[PDB]
PDB file of C-alpha atoms and ligand atoms in Angstrom:
ATOM      1  CA  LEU A 269      -0.020  -0.051   0.038  1.00 39.93           C
ATOM      2  CA  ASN A 270       2.501   2.764  -1.265  1.00 40.67           C
ATOM      3  CA  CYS A 271       3.532   1.925  -4.892  1.00 39.15           C
ATOM      4  CA  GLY A 272       0.000   1.592  -6.204  1.00 42.09           C
ATOM      5  CA  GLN A 273      -0.517   5.274  -7.201  1.00 44.86           C
ATOM      6  CA  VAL A 274       2.789   4.878  -8.546  1.00 44.46           C
ATOM      7  CA  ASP A 275       1.167   3.127 -11.661  1.00 43.20           C
ATOM      8  CA  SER A 276      -2.247   4.431 -11.151  1.00 43.60           C
ATOM      9  CA  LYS A 277      -0.740   7.625 -12.306  1.00 43.53           C
ATOM     10  CA  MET A 278       2.454   6.951 -14.301  1.00 43.94           C
ATOM     11  CA  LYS A 279       1.720   3.640 -16.151  1.00 43.64           C
ATOM     12  CA  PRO A 280       1.805   5.557 -19.440  1.00 44.90           C
ATOM     13  CA  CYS A 281       4.964   7.331 -18.702  1.00 42.95           C
ATOM     14  CA  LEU A 282       7.069   4.192 -17.661  1.00 41.86           C
ATOM     15  CA  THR A 283       5.542   2.311 -20.501  1.00 39.98           C
ATOM     16  CA  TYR A 284       6.815   5.357 -22.581  1.00 42.90           C
ATOM     17  CA  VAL A 285      10.491   5.250 -21.329  1.00 43.72           C
ATOM     18  CA  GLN A 286      10.846   1.385 -21.571  1.00 42.86           C
ATOM     19  CA  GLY A 287       8.858   1.620 -24.990  1.00 39.76           C
ATOM     20  CA  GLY A 288       5.266   0.475 -24.390  1.00 41.13           C
ATOM     21  CA  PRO A 289       1.850   2.172 -25.005  1.00 41.55           C
ATOM     22  CA  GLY A 290       2.553   5.762 -23.784  1.00 42.43           C
ATOM     23  CA  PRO A 291       2.885   8.774 -23.228  1.00 45.86           C
ATOM     24  CA  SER A 292      -0.104  10.149 -25.363  1.00 46.36           C
ATOM     25  CA  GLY A 293      -2.175  12.163 -22.916  1.00 46.53           C
ATOM     26  CA  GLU A 294      -2.631   9.979 -19.854  1.00 50.35           C
ATOM     27  CA  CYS A 295       1.040  10.322 -19.240  1.00 50.42           C
ATOM     28  CA  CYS A 296       1.337  14.279 -19.386  1.00 49.14           C
ATOM     29  CA  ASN A 297      -1.711  14.577 -17.025  1.00 44.60           C
ATOM     30  CA  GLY A 298      -0.660  11.591 -14.965  1.00 44.44           C
ATOM     31  CA  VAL A 299       2.845  13.269 -14.712  1.00 41.03           C
ATOM     32  CA  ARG A 300       1.588  16.938 -14.045  1.00 38.02           C
ATOM     33  CA  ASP A 301      -0.504  15.022 -11.563  1.00 42.53           C
ATOM     34  CA  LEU A 302       2.004  12.957  -9.791  1.00 46.11           C
ATOM     35  CA  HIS A 303       4.278  15.891  -9.691  1.00 47.29           C
ATOM     36  CA  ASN A 304       1.539  17.761  -7.696  1.00 46.51           C
ATOM     37  CA  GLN A 305      -0.193  14.553  -6.535  1.00 48.91           C
ATOM     38  CA  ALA A 306       2.739  12.665  -4.930  1.00 46.06           C
ATOM     39  CA  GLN A 307       3.082  15.553  -2.390  1.00 48.56           C
ATOM     40  CA  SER A 308       1.092  13.699   0.497  1.00 51.08           C
ATOM     41  CA  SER A 309       3.879  11.960   2.474  1.00 52.08           C
ATOM     42  CA  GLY A 310       6.679  12.278  -0.327  1.00 53.25           C
ATOM     43  CA  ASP A 311       5.316   9.711  -2.536  1.00 51.83           C
ATOM     44  CA  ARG A 312       7.705  10.442  -5.642  1.00 49.85           C
ATOM     45  CA  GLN A 313      10.569   9.321  -3.167  1.00 50.05           C
ATOM     46  CA  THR A 314       8.851   6.229  -2.692  1.00 49.34           C
ATOM     47  CA  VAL A 315       8.003   5.810  -6.274  1.00 48.03           C
ATOM     48  CA  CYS A 316      11.846   6.321  -6.935  1.00 49.47           C
ATOM     49  CA  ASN A 317      12.429   3.000  -5.250  1.00 52.28           C
ATOM     50  CA  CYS A 318       9.493   1.369  -7.339  1.00 51.97           C
ATOM     51  CA  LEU A 319      11.037   2.818 -10.391  1.00 56.80           C
ATOM     52  CA  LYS A 320      14.597   1.689  -9.190  1.00 54.39           C
ATOM     53  CA  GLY A 321      13.394  -1.786  -8.602  1.00 55.30           C
ATOM     54  CA  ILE A 322      11.581  -2.332 -12.047  1.00 52.10           C
ATOM     55  CA  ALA A 323      14.336  -0.216 -13.775  1.00 52.90           C
ATOM     56  CA  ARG A 324      16.747  -2.618 -12.339  1.00 49.53           C
ATOM     57  CA  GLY A 325      16.204  -4.951 -15.388  1.00 49.81           C
ATOM     58  CA  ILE A 326      13.217  -3.412 -17.543  1.00 49.76           C
ATOM     59  CA  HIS A 327      12.932  -3.523 -21.277  1.00 49.44           C
ATOM     60  CA  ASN A 328      14.320  -0.555 -23.453  1.00 49.40           C
ATOM     61  CA  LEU A 329      14.977   2.552 -21.049  1.00 49.03           C
ATOM     62  CA  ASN A 330      14.732   5.504 -23.515  1.00 48.33           C
ATOM     63  CA  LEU A 331      16.154   7.834 -20.841  1.00 47.57           C
ATOM     64  CA  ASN A 332      16.226  10.750 -23.571  1.00 47.28           C
ATOM     65  CA  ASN A 333      12.365  10.277 -23.905  1.00 46.73           C
ATOM     66  CA  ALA A 334      11.979  10.027 -20.087  1.00 47.10           C
ATOM     67  CA  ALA A 335      13.992  13.275 -19.697  1.00 43.60           C
ATOM     68  CA  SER A 336      11.871  14.639 -22.373  1.00 41.29           C
ATOM     69  CA  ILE A 337       8.628  13.661 -20.486  1.00 43.13           C
ATOM     70  CA  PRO A 338       8.743  16.932 -18.535  1.00 45.30           C
ATOM     71  CA  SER A 339       9.443  19.056 -21.364  1.00 47.93           C
ATOM     72  CA  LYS A 340       6.654  17.251 -23.213  1.00 47.21           C
ATOM     73  CA  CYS A 341       4.162  17.182 -20.419  1.00 50.86           C
ATOM     74  CA  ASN A 342       4.394  20.847 -18.917  1.00 51.80           C
ATOM     75  CA  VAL A 343       5.288  19.443 -15.461  1.00 54.00           C
ATOM     76  CA  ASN A 344       8.605  21.360 -14.996  1.00 55.85           C
ATOM     77  CA  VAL A 345       9.832  19.513 -11.843  1.00 55.08           C
ATOM     78  CA  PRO A 346      13.610  18.824 -11.647  1.00 56.81           C
ATOM     79  CA  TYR A 347      12.731  15.156 -10.433  1.00 57.48           C
ATOM     80  CA  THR A 348      16.293  13.762 -10.847  1.00 59.63           C
ATOM     81  CA  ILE A 349      15.538  12.193 -14.262  1.00 62.14           C
ATOM     82  CA  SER A 350      17.870   8.971 -14.313  1.00 61.41           C
ATOM     83  CA  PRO A 351      18.056   5.292 -15.013  1.00 61.88           C
ATOM     84  CA  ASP A 352      18.408   4.229 -11.285  1.00 62.86           C
ATOM     85  CA  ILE A 353      16.750   7.294 -10.073  1.00 62.36           C
ATOM     86  CA  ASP A 354      17.843   8.321  -6.717  1.00 62.77           C
ATOM     87  CA  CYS A 355      14.824   9.632  -4.404  1.00 61.81           C
ATOM     88  CA  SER A 356      17.247  12.169  -2.819  1.00 63.35           C
ATOM     89  CA  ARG A 357      17.644  14.351  -5.852  1.00 61.56           C
ATOM     90  CA  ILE A 358      13.685  14.815  -6.420  1.00 61.92           C
ATOM     91  CA  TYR A 359      11.492  17.735  -5.389  1.00 61.66           C
TER      92      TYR A 359
HETATM   93  C1  LIG B 639       5.888  13.620 -11.043  1.00 59.65           C
HETATM   94  C2  LIG B 639       6.284  12.471 -12.044  1.00 59.65           C
HETATM   95  C3  LIG B 639       6.880  13.088 -13.064  1.00 59.65           C
HETATM   96  C4  LIG B 639       8.189  13.776 -13.073  1.00 59.65           C
HETATM   97  C5  LIG B 639       8.485  14.716 -14.342  1.00 59.65           C
HETATM   98  C6  LIG B 639       8.526  13.731 -15.558  1.00 59.65           C
HETATM   99  C7  LIG B 639       9.940  12.883 -15.344  1.00 59.65           C
HETATM  100  C8  LIG B 639       9.763  11.689 -15.077  1.00 59.65           C
HETATM  101  C9  LIG B 639      11.037  10.826 -15.301  1.00 59.65           C
HETATM  102  C10 LIG B 639      11.054   9.548 -14.879  1.00 59.65           C
HETATM  103  C11 LIG B 639      10.076   8.707 -15.818  1.00 59.65           C
HETATM  104  C12 LIG B 639       9.456   7.310 -15.050  1.00 59.65           C
HETATM  105  C13 LIG B 639       8.680   7.779 -14.228  1.00 59.65           C
HETATM  106  C14 LIG B 639       7.816   6.688 -13.405  1.00 59.65           C
HETATM  107  C15 LIG B 639       6.797   7.085 -12.369  1.00 59.65           C
HETATM  108  C16 LIG B 639       6.161   6.017 -11.709  1.00 59.65           C
HETATM  109  O1  LIG B 639       5.825   6.176 -10.338  1.00 59.65           O
HETATM  110  S1  LIG B 639       5.366   4.918 -12.692  1.00 59.65           S
HETATM  111  C17 LIG B 639       6.128   3.283 -11.894  1.00 59.65           C
HETATM  112  C18 LIG B 639       7.057   2.305 -12.494  1.00 59.65           C
HETATM  113  N1  LIG B 639       6.137   1.711 -13.715  1.00 59.65           N
HETATM  114  C19 LIG B 639       5.973   0.461 -13.722  1.00 59.65           C
HETATM  115  O2  LIG B 639       6.476  -0.323 -12.874  1.00 59.65           O
HETATM  116  C20 LIG B 639       5.053  -0.049 -14.749  1.00 59.65           C
HETATM  117  C21 LIG B 639       5.063  -1.596 -15.133  1.00 59.65           C
HETATM  118  N2  LIG B 639       4.170  -2.057 -14.010  1.00 59.65           N
HETATM  119  C22 LIG B 639       4.472  -3.013 -13.243  1.00 59.65           C
HETATM  120  O3  LIG B 639       5.618  -3.602 -13.212  1.00 59.65           O
HETATM  121  C23 LIG B 639       3.253  -3.501 -12.275  1.00 59.65           C
HETATM  122  O4  LIG B 639       2.124  -3.535 -13.095  1.00 59.65           O
HETATM  123  C24 LIG B 639       2.982  -2.526 -11.312  1.00 59.65           C
HETATM  124  C25 LIG B 639       4.062  -2.494 -10.316  1.00 59.65           C
HETATM  125  C26 LIG B 639       2.636  -1.240 -11.856  1.00 59.65           C
HETATM  126  C27 LIG B 639       1.823  -3.234 -10.369  1.00 59.65           C
HETATM  127  O5  LIG B 639       0.456  -3.648 -10.971  1.00 59.65           O
HETATM  128  P1  LIG B 639      -0.926  -3.672 -10.562  1.00 59.65           P
HETATM  129  O6  LIG B 639      -1.427  -5.119 -10.755  1.00 59.65           O
HETATM  130  O7  LIG B 639      -1.762  -2.731 -11.200  1.00 59.65           O
HETATM  131  O8  LIG B 639      -0.857  -3.377  -9.039  1.00 59.65           O
HETATM  132  P2  LIG B 639      -2.145  -3.488  -8.199  1.00 59.65           P
HETATM  133  O9  LIG B 639      -3.248  -2.658  -8.922  1.00 59.65           O
HETATM  134  O10 LIG B 639      -2.805  -5.003  -8.276  1.00 59.65           O
HETATM  135  O11 LIG B 639      -1.819  -3.143  -6.836  1.00 59.65           O
HETATM  136  C28 LIG B 639      -0.868  -2.323  -6.495  1.00 59.65           C
HETATM  137  C29 LIG B 639       0.265  -2.719  -5.396  1.00 59.65           C
HETATM  138  O12 LIG B 639       0.606  -4.085  -5.826  1.00 59.65           O
HETATM  139  C30 LIG B 639       2.001  -3.906  -6.209  1.00 59.65           C
HETATM  140  N3  LIG B 639       2.139  -4.893  -7.445  1.00 59.65           N
HETATM  141  C31 LIG B 639       1.296  -5.674  -8.112  1.00 59.65           C
HETATM  142  N4  LIG B 639       1.655  -6.416  -9.132  1.00 59.65           N
HETATM  143  C32 LIG B 639       2.999  -6.084  -8.968  1.00 59.65           C
HETATM  144  C33 LIG B 639       4.223  -6.648  -9.941  1.00 59.65           C
HETATM  145  N5  LIG B 639       3.934  -7.271 -10.815  1.00 59.65           N
HETATM  146  N6  LIG B 639       5.472  -6.189  -9.569  1.00 59.65           N
HETATM  147  C34 LIG B 639       5.546  -5.222  -8.410  1.00 59.65           C
HETATM  148  N7  LIG B 639       4.632  -4.861  -7.567  1.00 59.65           N
HETATM  149  C35 LIG B 639       3.369  -5.258  -8.016  1.00 59.65           C
HETATM  150  C36 LIG B 639       2.451  -2.514  -6.435  1.00 59.65           C
HETATM  151  O13 LIG B 639       3.649  -2.423  -6.212  1.00 59.65           O
HETATM  152  C37 LIG B 639       1.478  -1.866  -5.402  1.00 59.65           C
HETATM  153  O14 LIG B 639       2.085  -1.748  -4.047  1.00 59.65           O
HETATM  154  P3  LIG B 639       1.418  -0.966  -3.004  1.00 59.65           P
HETATM  155  O15 LIG B 639       2.516  -0.663  -1.934  1.00 59.65           O
HETATM  156  O16 LIG B 639       0.831   0.391  -3.533  1.00 59.65           O
HETATM  157  O17 LIG B 639       0.269  -1.708  -2.365  1.00 59.65           O
END
């Protein structure tokens, strides 16, 4: 009960970076949302670890696309933006 939202809100964005059925629309809002939504108990810092764990092995991390999520999805948060994302460099 912590890394559920994770997906509920960014499924289309992780799909996007590993090469699946995203980011279309649901990602940008899911994203803008998450930036502003994952501010309950620090969620994105929890998310980080969830990301890290799948990332761990994943499919085709197109980090360029990932680092392009924010620019593409008007969510302007510095959010670390990296393969094995560290929770300590998020905002
Ligand atoms: C504000 C963000 C935007 C910043 C600016 C843009 C730049 C962003 C740059 C980084 C890009 C990537 C960002 C990712 C953000 C996310 O948080 S998306 C998370 C990573 N995505 C995935 O892992 C997608 C692939 N999905 C799975 O591996 C699996 O389907 C998941 C883990 C999503 C779970 O599936 P569900 O089946 O939907 O889970 P369920 O609804 O039953 O229940 C949730 C609960 O169960 C755990 N669970 C279930 N099944 C799994 C599997 N197979 N593996 C792991 N965990 C599983 C979930 O962890 C969750 O745990 P709770 O603690 O919430 O109970």
